[PDB]
């Protein structure tokens, strides 16, 4: 593909789509880059991002309530380079499940009641991230990360 970019896992997508990300290439720096997998989550990279020759397939993995960028930091470029910069993460589907029912807790009430946001927000804090929000309807947990 145009500016050496690999993304083939079914389920993953990018904004702009891999397509446009061709007619953008000549190298391939595209601001407001987005990468995500339906049903699981997404990752927003605001402003200028250099995709030049990244192999997304190997670099970014978005799994239920757990996103990971750069498998073995042996590659994790200088903080700022490639996707190792900062970004917004959204993990959809995140919901807790009770010990008894093992049925997932979606009721915005119960959630509110057991302050799930609390945990999620806390978690992001310990991880050194910036908790932005928790949307119950979709179980979307979003937070900022300075780097991966």
């Amino acid at each position: 593909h145009p500016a050496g970019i690999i993304l083939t896992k079914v389920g993953y997508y990018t904004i702009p789509s891999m397509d446009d990300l061709a007619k953008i290439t000549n190298e391939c720096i595209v601001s407001d880059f987005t990468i995500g997998r339906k049903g699981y989550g997404s990752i927003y990279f605001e402003g200028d991002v250099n995709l030049t020759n990244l192999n997304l397939d190997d670099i970014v993995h978005i799994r239920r309530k757990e996103v990971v960028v750069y498998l073995d930091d042996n590659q994790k470029p200088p903080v700022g380079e490639g996707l190792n910069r900062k970004a917004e993460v959204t993990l959809d589907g995140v919901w807790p499940t009770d010990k008894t029912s093992r049925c997932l807790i979606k009721s915005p009430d119960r959630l509110a009641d057991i302050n799930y946001e609390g945990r999620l927000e806390a978690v992001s804090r310990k991880q050194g991230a910036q908790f932005k929000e928790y949307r119950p309807e979709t179980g979307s947990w979003v937070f900022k990360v300075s780097h991966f």
């Binding site: 799994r63 309530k65 757990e66 996103v67 990971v68 960028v69 993460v89 993990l91 995140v94 945990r119 999620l120 978690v123 992001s124 991880q127 991230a129 947990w141 937070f143 990360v145 991966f148």
Partner: peptide, 6 residues
């Protein structure tokens, strides 16, 4: 790596 492990 970031997420909820448990």
């Amino acid at each position: 790596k970031y997420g909820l492990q448990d």
